[PDB]
Structures are given as structure tokens and as C-alpha cells.
Amino acid sequence: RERMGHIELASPTAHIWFLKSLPSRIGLLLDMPLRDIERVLYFESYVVI
Amino acid sequence: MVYSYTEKKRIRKDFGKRPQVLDVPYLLSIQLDSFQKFIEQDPEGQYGLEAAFRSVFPIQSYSGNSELQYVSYRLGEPVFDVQECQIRGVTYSAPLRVKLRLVIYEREAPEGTVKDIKEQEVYMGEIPLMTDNGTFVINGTERVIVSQLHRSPGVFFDSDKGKTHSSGKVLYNARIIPYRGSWLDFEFDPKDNLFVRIDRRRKLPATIILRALNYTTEQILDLFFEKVIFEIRDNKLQMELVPERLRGETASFDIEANGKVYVEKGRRITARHIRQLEKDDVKLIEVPVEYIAGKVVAKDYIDESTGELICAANMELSLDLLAKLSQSGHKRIETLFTNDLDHGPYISETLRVDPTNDRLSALVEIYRMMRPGEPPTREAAESLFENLFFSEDRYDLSAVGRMKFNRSLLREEIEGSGILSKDDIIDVMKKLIDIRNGKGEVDDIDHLGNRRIRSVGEMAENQFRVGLVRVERAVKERLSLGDLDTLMPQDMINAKPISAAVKEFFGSSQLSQFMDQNNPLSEITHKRRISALGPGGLTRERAGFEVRDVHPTHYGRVCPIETPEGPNIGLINSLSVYAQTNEYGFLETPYRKVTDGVVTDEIHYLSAIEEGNYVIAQANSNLDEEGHFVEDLVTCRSKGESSLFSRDQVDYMDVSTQQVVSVGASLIPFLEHDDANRALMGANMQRQAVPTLRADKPLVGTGMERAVAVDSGVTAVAKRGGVVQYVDASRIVIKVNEDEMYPGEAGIDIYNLTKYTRSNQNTCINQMPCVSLGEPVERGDVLADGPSTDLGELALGQNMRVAFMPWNGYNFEDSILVSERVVQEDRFTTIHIQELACVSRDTKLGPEEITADIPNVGEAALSKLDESGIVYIGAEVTGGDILVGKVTPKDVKDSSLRVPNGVSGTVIDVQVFTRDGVEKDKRALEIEEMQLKQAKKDLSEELQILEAGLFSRIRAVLVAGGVEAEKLDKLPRDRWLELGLTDEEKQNQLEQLAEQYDELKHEFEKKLEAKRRKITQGDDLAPGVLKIVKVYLAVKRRIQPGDKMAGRHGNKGVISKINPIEDMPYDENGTPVDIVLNPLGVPSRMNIGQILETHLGMAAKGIGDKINAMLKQQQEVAKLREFIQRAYDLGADVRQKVDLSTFSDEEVMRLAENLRKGMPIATPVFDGAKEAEIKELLKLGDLPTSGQIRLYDGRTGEQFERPVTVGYMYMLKLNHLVDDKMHARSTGSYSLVTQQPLGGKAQFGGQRFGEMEVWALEAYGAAYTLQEMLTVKSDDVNGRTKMYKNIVDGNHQMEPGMPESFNVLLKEIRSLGINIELEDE
Amino acid sequence: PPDLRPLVPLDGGRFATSDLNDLYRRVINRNNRLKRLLDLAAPDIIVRNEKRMLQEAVDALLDNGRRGRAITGSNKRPLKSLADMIKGKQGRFRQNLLGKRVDYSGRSVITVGPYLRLHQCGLPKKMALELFKPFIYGKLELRGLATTIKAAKKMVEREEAVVWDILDEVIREHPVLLNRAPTLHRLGIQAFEPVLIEGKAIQLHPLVCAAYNADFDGDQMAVHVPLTLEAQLEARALMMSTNNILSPANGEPIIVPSQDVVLGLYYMTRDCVNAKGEGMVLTGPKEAERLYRSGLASLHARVKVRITEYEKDANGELVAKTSLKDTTVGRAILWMIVPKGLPYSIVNQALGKKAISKMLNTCYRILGLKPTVIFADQIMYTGFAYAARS
Amino acid sequence: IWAAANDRVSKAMMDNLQTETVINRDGQEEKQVSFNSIYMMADSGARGSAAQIRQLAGMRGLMAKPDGSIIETPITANFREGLNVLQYFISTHGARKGLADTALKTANSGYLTRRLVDVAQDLVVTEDDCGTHEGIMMTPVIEGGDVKEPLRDRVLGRVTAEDVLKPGTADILVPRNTLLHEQWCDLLEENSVDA
DNA sequence: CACCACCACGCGGGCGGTAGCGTGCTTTTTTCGATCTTCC
DNA sequence: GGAAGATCGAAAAAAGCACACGCTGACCCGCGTGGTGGTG
RNA sequence: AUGUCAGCGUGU
Ligand SMILES: [Mg+2]
């Protein structure tokens, strides 16, 4: 009833709750528009680091 | 008038005054007729399968080398009968076969030369068939597909009356709703700009849809505006002035023409100046050059010499631009006639806002709207726009859609293509612009003329068309595969999509509902139901207020009172008695044409839209029997509103007083004396009454019981006339008349009555004969009485002796006090049948078997079971008893079906279905033997009749030839075949008759073999199951405190106390009353119908008691004839006339025997018996005229200080029994996820302590009780166990612990990327 | 954990939907495929798509249908994700935490019981026997009538008479919480003393209907059993109907005669002009009642009766005052139930709804709580009896 | 005109119902209050009211179409008498409007109650006196013709915030922190206290 | 020994299609392009 | 005099829509490939 | 020893 499991993700994935629930915490923290974050997240535009 | 044989048994007294001009039509016609249109062979492809096949077929291959065309379709005979389908569980359906031709053309010459033709018939699935009662049998269960009231296809203009923009301005919009396609909307912006939306997408300027239709700016401006010509003079610059254009104008400049100052500068042009200019007929008027700059040029003007655009189309003019135009040589210019109030410049403003400038740009913008992300290409945009509205395969404006479209635009023609065109959209936008300007009015969306009714046929045809287009895509896939020289159409098509679509529609649709079989009225109302819900319709939560109200067009088409009370009120309606459907789906109602004042009898069915123009009088308008209204000022209705009118201005007349109510609402006597709300409750409750074990006729009725009983398929109705040859409690055999005989037939009708079969509401369906041996019958006469039916009349409740008085608070709010006799005589005892299924499947380890031995059980528990493992029929079982002994392999585990706890009764029926291949047990063999014996009995009766006829012919021939009649009589009848005659034509006749006898015997043997094969064919089941055993339990529910009872006038209540017989109030003669009711209900709940019904029932029972007393004295038939004739003649110009002179003595006696328990009275729903007639009928018997008698107290005996109202009232026992409502729980099973107790009564479960209860406890100081309910009673498992052991030990203390639901929620949140925990610190 | 997303056997060889298991399986498939792609050094044109769709699967598992289109299930419908089973009306917060299902509870239709007192409710025998089962087991084991819990269960099932006696013993002063389904305000649930009745419907006091907004109409109600000492004390001291006499919303009384009590008391307190026994002189209310029951004087006869009324002085005691009053027989009869402290002006008039309410208010203000409760019960009894007799 | 006619009919009916009963005294006759069952039920307050009785015996009066406007011709027939088809259809409009309103009111009322409970579920009396000298004014509420609520109802069962002075005398009428029960309210109203 | 029938099964996904699917609610928050204005 | 702050209006997206109970049906991958197995 | 969907109904 209590023990949980875990899956080791091969590639990092964004947590949808923080990304989507307006205002976006990722976007607010990084000061980037939600469109840019959601398009770099789903592999359609590169982003500089 | 002469009465039918069943009616002459008991004639209902009728108080109706107005003669019946039109008889009530068949109630279920709206269900049957439509389905007919679905399956009838139509030479023209307008409705049904023929229309669908014509729409889809022919089917062309990808390459123009071959095709597949459709010739004809045929529906095969159903494999199983309706009864067989119901008892076996299969779906009542018929195979569909289609004649298909495969045409392979010439490869070298594709101009149309053919090479090979292959014709075949292919089977493409089963179509479920409608029974004679307008109901479907899906998976062995009765289903009803209710009609849907949905917005009709067409163009609708509406607006929001200031609900938006906070400014009060109305934003007019227009919608083009197709039957199949995309919706086109034209809305008006707050800034007066026309925008176009497709499928509720982003709005675009309305000129885009015009540009996409190959239209330039000049063409659009020509279409949408009036051109003013400004001819350039030397210095006058005179305009082509129209006097009408001066209306509603401001003269900022002096209007002078013909050397006269017509209008002075600074003066508004009043109507006087407009009229004077109209009289002047002056065209050319001098204009200053400043007036031109404020206008917009109509068309592009080009300086040919220089080849540059001096002015384009549609921009504001200016002084420099005007000078350039003048010097360019352009003498004649055109501009737009625009008025701030008459002709607004909406199109020009929209064009200015519109960014597109060419057809390709507009198409690209439309494509970008429709398909974001995809690259807009010329081909893609062209294809998308062509397929949006101008392709038959994607857009379908139906025939009714086209008719409404043309009518809304005032077009003479009512026929056209099913696709849109440039003209249609242009006209729609023009009409919307006119409506915005002021001309025209918006369309009432809730108008019943704008709402179509879709029946079963239309929906079935649509689903079939969807399946057919899927199949046609699948067959176009295979039609281009080549090698067609060796391919047949049988294997070319696949029937899976059509069958899947039709099955999903008939089994799992929004409107294919379970049929409610509480009583015949329930089924009748359910079949005649119109639901606004369903696909392509309203939603229960978002229905709103304005759509649930009673529109004035509901008169005569939708019942205003019969509607469910709850969330779906006003969205579900019942069809009126006389209402019917057009060919387009719109409802229509009958009317009597009124010509030259005198009302005629020709019936015209007027629709909602057309009936507005005419003036329709009421049903209750007095006539002098010559057709002329007695008074001049008849109350009529013109357009959804009522008013007085002259007697010569009437156009149509209502056909009946029942035209405005439904069938269920017309069964309430004295409906005109009840409040509308109480009438609604009574009508709703009427179709919830369970049928008792003895149907009792209503002493007061409305005369519609006969129609409801006959039309519903609950009673057995003779197909042909004749005499009843054989009567039994189970079957009836009728010897048909020689007139109705068919050639080569024995001529007997066999009716097998259904006895004690469960309905969909777990009630009991039972049919009882109402005829005797030798009694002649006619076509349409009732032979058996179904549930809640007495001699062909609907009988839902019982006639109970009621008294209206308070009785020691036992009828305080709405309670009912019931005498002990009501329980003693079983007046309200009902039978309920419950079905329990044991499914013997196949498991992975092995197949389970239904056997007579179960491990770890005793012989006493197994005593009821036989050696076959199925309980004995007629054995008394109770909760926890084993019914179908089953053991499944683990050696084996007991999984036998058991009677649910709290359920008892007697096993009355066991049905075993076996998959083909599996051996049949002894019980299955016994059931098959019984069915075979019944079939053999029927066929043997037919054979006996036919062989008796043939042997009579043989004996006649023999006695004519050999005159051996005495020898033949002495000889056995069979040996007559052996005996012959001399060599003559007599021998040839005997040989022919013997051959006929042999062939008839062979034919009937073949019939018996066919019946036996059909019985023994076997039933197909779902995968994994090898046997099914269904057991039926019958329980006698007797009335008791807590049971809900009700009358027909909305007066409901719960039985509060079963008073002893001696305690009930009694009259002078010592007869106690049966029911005591609180008078306090009447003044508040304004239903005076119950009081009048009580008085009329008292009068009827007094007449019946007088008849019974006369019968008990063995009085001569003359006295009975005189008394019954006097009773029937009572009234005030009643339409019903009964003549007992022609009745003969014997029938009269029978009639008297039927009237000895109260003469029935029929009270029409709006033409009923008045108070004077009731008093006259009361005075005819030995009863007080006032209707109030003097009662005595049962317990003490003193006279009540005032006379009380006693009488007879019709009481109904609703399907809300206390034994089905009571539940209790102390400790049981719990849910496995939240560790909370289960919910419901079927499974042992506790009541839900909701949030509001927690709030109420918090409002108190209740903290320990709340915590105890939250944790130690429900969630804390350790708390539960410790509390149980403590209370058993006697300590009333708790350990609250921690609810498990909170731990579950904690782990649930923890399962996300969020950490949540409890800190000890 | 698996137990919070269980796989339910379907007794037919198949299993339930198990939405969470489906989403987890989808995520595991995507993760394994991405691992396989990565370990093969796949080009950045293929692993990119697999990573994006793995992110989509994770999105669906955490919040289905949040961004794009919900993962369609086997029934052509959106699936339920982890977030979908916490939020909403069907979520864990509002369906299993704020409210829940509880044991020691039952439900049945209601029925009027006139003989009941204000603090009593009629409970059916079967519901009472089943709800108080643990108490019955404890009492059975305490008195030695059974040797074990199984024996007590067998005795309860066999429906022995001693079981009924024990049940009568255990519910002597054990209040039960009666509740109605729409609990609009605080008075929607109240504590009543159970009286065992033979039947199938719960018998409710006529006076407490107005607080419940209940009608004997087929409406059902639920019964809960407080099973701690603290819970019983809270029910008796806070939730009892005797305590709840003033509405917390505005302080107005909630116990008021409504339909038949008012009619009966109105019929009693009314005067004719030529009734039998008019103008007679009677010694007291007892003589008037005897005369009415003997059929000698009508209930509306105008007579003069010598009555004694008690008034409260400053010291708090009662001082009597006896005098002849001109009244009717019915009012004199009704005076026999009025408590001592009240004056005679209350009943010497035609008693309507407002008059009865004012009389009860004066009784509450002057006398207290117990006299008011007894007076209300007597008023209801007399109103019912004389409405029946009228 | 029709409203006046309905009022006249109702008044005439009530006059003919409430006191028509004429009874002989020991000598001559007289008029007494009627013993009619309907009138007894209405007057005693058991069930019903003047409107329902006037619908039972007098004309049913004007009825309104679903849009809310009044229909010109009223229902001139009682429930004891017969209502024709047109009058019943007219009344069904209002009946259906009321039924739909009461069917759709429940969800909105429940949602509002849920929001109100959740906004104030954490407020509990957890002290005895803050010593606050700040209170609010309370005056009888009067809006152009009627006294909607007397001051006694508004200030009943509440604690004074400051020493209430006798009007025009500057003398304490009630102390600073006295709970205004019935006797204090009588004292306040006997001195004509406004605020 | 290919040869047809039968069952694991596995990874796969929106589904089926030579494209679209949707069309009768109200309130709150975001956001994003178009206008303006205005100001340094 | 043009870029940036202010406005702003429309489009989009999210969140909500009483409680309690009773009953009914209907369903709870897939599917096309590869491997396996009896066979005449 | 479930769940969900759809429908009907009861009491408010
Ligand atoms: Mg009720």
C-alpha cells in the first residue's frame, strides 16, 4: 500500500504542472515567453546557454 | 350507433357534449410510419436505404478502368420471431442483400466502352427490425428510440439584445446550418464590420469569402451598394439625384434646381420637401465640389494617356483627388449611396479592414485560418475552399434545409442543389445587412417552426450512410487492385463498418433508451417522446432558461404539462393526441376548415409556420349545430397570442378539446379543475403505478382508456372475426369466419398469451382471457387483458372509498391512513419478478460445470437442487440460498449463484442457453421437449381441421358414388382410404383426394421438423461462455406503511398507519371508509379535480349499488332495462346515445352483471360533467346531493360535529416501496483503494456523510462526533478494529488514529515531482 | 504503489481498465525505446522525435489533455491521469476526505408519528436491531446468554426474544442522529431518542418537520449512531431537538404548529351564538370538559367558569387568583393544559397560527425550557385530537 | 380595468365567505363569523392564503407570458368552474417558468453555499474582549417611505461600543460595554434613540 | 517438408485517410499584436 | 522624431457549474507480423 | 468483490 517505485528517465523532461499552470513558473523564473519555452521543450527551436 | 362486442359488455357513460369530428389516430404511428420510410422500396431515391445507396453508389476506381454499381436491395425475412428473440436474447433483425454489378471497362479505350459485366447479390449485414408496437428488440431487450427535436438546417438570423459590449448595441449574426458540413457565420462587429467564421474559428473580414469566390472590389461594391453618378458639368458637377435618396437626410448645402430654391441651406429636408421634389421629378441638381470629397468612389478609374491609377476602388475622396480626376478627362464618376441610418457603409469599412487584395491572397488567408502551420499553397487552398461548401461529398444542405433556406430568403422555388453557391451566400449577406439596416426581423430560434423532429428512420439512415461511405472507401481501395477478371462482388466489399455503425446506433446511442414497462401508459408515453438532447442537440447542464419555456407554437403539438420535473425540464416533451409530422419533419396539427361562418368537417393539417397567418378558434366555442357560432365575439388566436374576433373572421377551428394535451395528460379526469403544476405531477406519477393482481376499472375516466389499451401491444386483439373455438388460461383458438377465410387454409387463429413474464422494471406482465366459449368476435376485439387492463380499458389503480377529514394527525402533512380491509382484500398487492443469471464460462485451468454436488455443503442446502444442478421450479427460496450449483476448477472452488441477501420468493421460470457443441443437460432437454410439445399441439390442431375437411369430402364423394354411408360410419375413418369404388371418375376423385391427404401430411411433417430444428438450433453467446442459466423469482409485495400512493391529480403520500377495520369512521349503514385523507392539502395544492372525482365516483358507486340491489332481488329484466336506460339517459345534451331496446334480454343481463360494482363514467378532459350533472346523478341514487354524509367515530362512536366528504377515488400504487428503500449497516466490506465502506443497497454499504453534514456538525459544538465519524468509523482500520472490540467489551472509547484516505492522497501528490510530508516537530 | 492503482479481477478472464497502469506502461515503453535508440548512437534526427514523444507521454501521465489532445482510451475518450484523480468534484479531496461513507448508519422513508414526544423518534425494529449489533453482542456476552461472538451472531440471526429484550435495553438512552439529504443549515441533523416500532418506516415527530423541511411525501432520511461516550453526550447536550428551539439564523423559534394543530385549536377556541348549554355557569374546567364529553354543551357554547390563574411575583414564586371568567367551553377545556405561570388572556381568544406561536413564546419567556417542551407536546396532542373530533 | 375587476371580485367573494353565516339567537337573528371549512382553513393559518382561496373561488386574474409581459385577457374562470383550453395553456406558461426556475436554482444555491462556507470555515470565537473602542453605527434603515427595519431589530443582542448618552442630556443611558438585551432595547426605544 | 492453421506478442498509437474531427455558458486571467503618445 | 511605455481590445485558455439515493444497459486494446505446430 | 460512461427516476 505504501512502497513506491521509480523510473530512471533516459532524457530529462519538463514537469507539466510548473510549465503550463499560468503563470508559468519556468517562464517567470527564466523571464522567457511561454511560447519560446514550449517550442524549445518540444524540439522545434534551439536555445543558447 | 351500434357498439362492438367488447364494448357492449360494459358501456361507459359519457358526459361529452361536443360531437367527435375526428377520431383519435393510432398512438404509435409516429414510431411505425417513419421506420416504414426507412425500409420501404422507394422508386425515387428520397428516403431510406434506396436513397443512401443512390447517394453513395456507383463507386469508381482510382483509375477510370472499372466501377461497381448498385441495382436493387432486398430485406430478407427475419430468422427468429419477436418472441423467440426476446426469450433467447438475440437481436430481432433481418438480413439485407444488395444487387451489385461489377463493370470492367476496356483498358485501351476508356471513352466508355465496357469489357466485362458481373452481376451478383451480396449480403451486407443485418438491420434490426421494428415490431408491431414501434419498439426494437436489441440483444433480447426492449429498446425505444425517441425522436429528437433539433434545429432545422437553413439560414437563421439572430442577435444579442445588448447582452454584450456593455453599450446596449445589438450585434446581429447569421448562421447557415447544414445537415452535413461546416457552419458559416456572419457576425456584426461593434464597430459595424462584417466578419465571417467557419466552424467557430477565428473571425475574418466578410469580404474575404467574396474575394475567394473570384470577386473584385468593383463587383462587390456593385453588388452591395447603389451607385450615385456624379456627371461633371462645366462648373455645376450635377449629380444623378433620386428623390427617395433625400429621405432622412440633412441639407448642409442649399438644394436648388430648375431655378428654384427647393431647400435652403441649414434646413433639414422634411417630408414636405421630399414630396415636392418627387412631384418635381428633377434629376440633375447642382452640387458644390466640397460635397464630393466625403464620398467613396465606386470603381477604379484609370488615366489611359498616362497609364497610372489616379483613383483606385473604395477609398475616401479628397479635393486634390477630385481635381486630378477632373483634369484627367474622367467626366463620369460613380460613388456609393450611403446613409447613416438607411444604408450603412459596412461593406466598405470591412473592405478597408480586409488586408487581402486578390483571390489567391484571400484563399491563402482562409487556408492559414483553417490549417495552422501547414504551408499555404495554391493547390491546397483551392482544394480546401472548393471542398468546404461546393462539394456534394462534404457539404449537404438537405431537402428540408434547402426549403428553409429558400423560404427564409423569399424565393419562389423550393427545390435546389444540396450544396451552396455564390448566389446563396450573397443573398444571406444581403439579408443580414438589411436586418442590420432595419428592414426585416430576426428569426425566433425557439419557434417550433424552426425545430425539426428526427425519428428512428432518419437517424438509422444517417448511421447507415456513414457505414456505407466507410465501406465505399474500403471498396475503392480494392477496386484499383487489378486482377478483377476473377473477382466477385461478394468478396469485394466488407460488411464490418455498416454492421458496426448500425449496432452502435441501436445499442449504445443517446436516444436508444431502455423501454420502461411499468404499465401500458408508460410505454405509450415513452414511444411518443421528443427529446431535445442527444447528438447534435442541447445539453442538460447548459440548456438555459429560454429554451425550457412553453412557446405559443406548442399548442396542439407538444403537451404543455407532461414533462419531467428535474434537470431536464422542458427539454423532454410528449406529442399531442392529434399531432403528426410533415414530410420535412415539422410538426402539424389538425383543424376544421371554417367557410362562410359555418364550420365544416374537412380536416387540414396545419404546420407551425403556416398556422400563424390564419385565425384559429378554440375547441370550446359553442355552436348552434348549424356550424354558426352562437355569439359574435369568438375568442381566437392570431399569431401566438389570444384575442377576441368577429364570427366571420375565423379561418380554422380546433378539432377537439384533447388536441392540446398528450395521451398521459388526457387520462386525468376533471383536468380543467387542477393547477398546472399539480396536473404535471399527476401525469408524471400516473406512468409510475405498478399493476396490481386484479385490474380495476376507473369509476371516473376520460374515455381514452380504450384507445390507450388497444394501441399499446399489451392486450391480445383478434386479427379476424369468427367464434372462439377454444378458451384456456394460457391460449385462445378462434375459428375464423368463412368470409375472412383464405384459400388452402384450415382457418384458425391461435393466440398464446404471455403469463407471468418479467418486464424491464422487474414487474410482472400477465395476460388473462376475457372471452368465453362460443362467443362471436370481430376484427379488432380484445381477446385477452394485459397488465393493468380490464376489458380493454386502462386500469392502473383501484377505486377506494375515501373520506376527507383530519384523523388524529395520522395524515398530518401528506400521509394516508389506510383501512385494514385494503390489506385484507389484497387490493394493492403486486407481483414483482427478479432475474438472476449464472454464467458458466471457460477458465484457463479448465471448464467449470453446473452440478448437483458442491464441496463443504450439507444435504439440506442441496435438497432444493435436483440432480441437474438447477433448483426445482416452484421451490420457495430465501436470501443466501443456492440456486445454480456451480464449481470452478482451482480441486474445485464453489462459485454458485446465490439469492441476494434480503431477497426471497418462488422460482417460476428457468431458461438455459447452451452454445452449439456443448452437451445439453436434462433440464434443457425438458424445456426443449415442452416447447416441441406445444408446437406439435398447434400443428396437430391445424392438421385435425384440414384432415376433417378432407375426410368429409371423401365421405361425400363415396356416398354420392357407392352410397355406403352406414358401412363407412361402421368402418374406421382411416380405412376409408383403403376402401375404393368401381372404375369411374369416382375412383379418380378418391385417388386425387388420397394424394392430397398424403402431400398435406408430408407438408405438416416438414413444418413440425422446421419448428423442431428452430427450437433445437442453439444460441450463440459471447466468447468464453459455454452456458447461461437464468432464474426468475416472483415476490408478492403487499401494501404497508411507508409505501407511496398517489392519485391522478398530483395528490401523493405515504401510508402512515394500517388502521384496524373497527377503528375506521363509518356511516349510518355501518360501512367503514377505506382511505382517510387530510383536507388541508386541497386549499394549498389547488387540485379541485380530486373533490369532483370523489363526488362523481360516489354517484357512480351509488348507481352500481342500486343495480346490485335490484339484481339481488331477482327482479324481472324489464325493471333492470328501465333503470339502466334511465341512468344512461341522464345528462344535458350528451353526445352518447344508448338504446337498450335492441340489446335483447341476455346481453342486458350480462351488462347488468358488469355494472353491479359501479357504472363507469367517462369525463372528457375539457368537456366533462358539470356540477349540475353530478348532482343529478347523485339524486338518481339514494345519496345526498351535497356529496357530504354524516360519519361516526370508529373508536368512540360519537357523531363528527360536521358532515364529511366521502366518496370513491382512483388510487395508484407508485413504484416506490419501503422495502426497496430501507437499508442499514453496522460493519461490512470496504473499498480496496480508499479503505472506505462500500456504497449502495445492492451491496452492503453505509450512507454517505457528505460535506454539508460535516458543515452542520461544525455549526454545532460537535467535535468528538465529527472526528469519530471521520476516522474511527470509516477510514482508520486500526481504529475500526479497536472500536469494535471495545464496544463488544463495553468500553465506549475511541482511538482516532490517522485516516487512510489522507495517506492515499499524500502518496498521490508524492507521485508527482512534489514532496509533501508531516513533521513531528 | 500498486494497491492505490489496483488491477480488479473481472471474473471472466479479463481485467478492468486500470488507466494509471496504461499511462505508466506507455511511459515505460517510450523510455525503453529512447534508451535503445541512445545506446545505438542514433542520429539527432530520430532520437529528437523519440525524446519529444517521451516528453509528451510524461505530460499525459502527469496531466492528461493539459497541453494538446488527451490520450484516447479504449472507449474513445480522454484518460484519467495522476492530476485528474486529485482535483475536481470526484477527486480525492472532495470525495474521500471532506466527506465519506460511514458505518452504523441506515436510510429509510419517514412517516408521521403523533404519539411521539418532542425528544423521541420512531425507529423500525429491523433497522434498530441491525444498527446496534455490536451493542447487542456486548450485552449478550455480558449476561452469559451466549458463550462466544459466533453464538451471539447465531442468536441475532435466529431472532430470539431475548435479543429483542436486549435491544430494548441498549437503546434506552442512546440518541440517534437523524439527517436529511439536503443539509442546508445546522438543524438539518438532530438527535432523537429511539422508540422501537413494528414496521419499515422511520416515525418522525410532526413538530420537527419544519426544521428538517421534510414532508411525509416519500422523502427518505438517514440514521447515524454515535458510539462513544463523548459522542452520546454531545448528541444529548447539543444535537437534541429540545435544545434546538431557536433558529441560529435570526433567533426566531423553529417549533411552530403548522397544519392540523392550528386547525384543531382554532375549532376549539371559537364561539357560536346559540350552542347547547349557552349561558351556563360551571365550577371549573373539569366540569366543562365533562359537560362537553357528555353531549350536554357544545364546544362553542358561551359560558362563565370560575378559574384560578397563577402569576409570578418579584420573589419568583406563584400567587393564585381565582375569579369568574366569561369564555367558551373549548377555551376552558384548553386551559387544562396551560402551565401555571401563564395568564388566561392567551387562550381566551380564537387561536390561530400567530396566537399559538405567541402563546408558546410567552411560555418560553416566563417559565423556561422544560415547561415549554411539555406545553408544546400537549398543544400538539390536543390540536390533533380535536381536529379529528371536529 | 382587469386588475380592478379581479380585486372587486376577490373582495366580494371574501365578504360573501367570511361572515355570510346568519344564525338565530335566543330571540332574533344575527350575523356571526362563518364556519365554512375553506374559510376556517384560510383564517386559522393552517394551509393556504388569500391568494389561493381567491383562485379557488374568484377569478384567477392576469397571467404573464414567459417574456414577462402581461396578457390582455385574464383567466376569468375559477378552479371550481371550468377553464377552457386557452386559459389552461396560458397558465402553463407561468407554471413552467416557476418549475424551471426552482429546478435550476438548486445548483447555483449549493455552489454559493459551498463558496461561503469555504471562505469563512476558519473563524472561531477564541477570546472574550479585545478592549476595542471602535464600533459601527446602527440606525433604522429608511428608504423613501417605509421603515424597513426598526433599530430594535438591528441592535438586539449586541454589545455597545461606547457610553450611549440620553438624547440631549449628555447623561449615560446605558453603560459602555452592556449587551443590549430586550430590556435595554426597551430603554433605548423609550428615549427615542436613533443611532 | 512445404503448407495451412493457430497463437504469442510487441511495440504502438489519434484514427483513418488518399481529411478533418468542433458549431445552444459565464467569469477570470493571460497575452499579444495594433495604436498612441509621448518623451527624451 | 523614432523607440519605448501605456492602452486596449480581441483572441485564447482555464475553471466552474448542490446533495443523497434507486434502477437499467455497456464495456474493460490491437492487429498485423512472426513464430510455432499438426499434417498428408 | 471494481471503475467508468449513458439514460431514467425520486426527494428537496
Ligand atoms: Mg416530499
Numbering used by the authors:
A (entry chain J): 99 to 147
B (entry chain I): 1 to 890, 912 to 1342
C (entry chain J): 246 to 635
D (entry chain J): 685 to 879
Copy text from the publication.
We wondered how strongly the initial docking of RfaHCC onto the opsHP drives upstream DNA melting and hybrid expansion. Therefore, we assembled an EC on a scaffold in which a WC bp in the upstream DNA would have to be disrupted and formation of a non-WC C:U pair would have to be “forced” into the 11-bp hybrid. Strikingly, the 3.1 Å structure revealed that the ensuing RfaHCC-bound complex was virtually identical to opsPECEnc, with the 11-bp hybrid, even though the C:U bp does not energetically fully compensate for the lost DNA bp. We conclude that docking of RfaH provides a strong driving force for hybrid expansion, leading to a hyper-paused opsPECEnc.
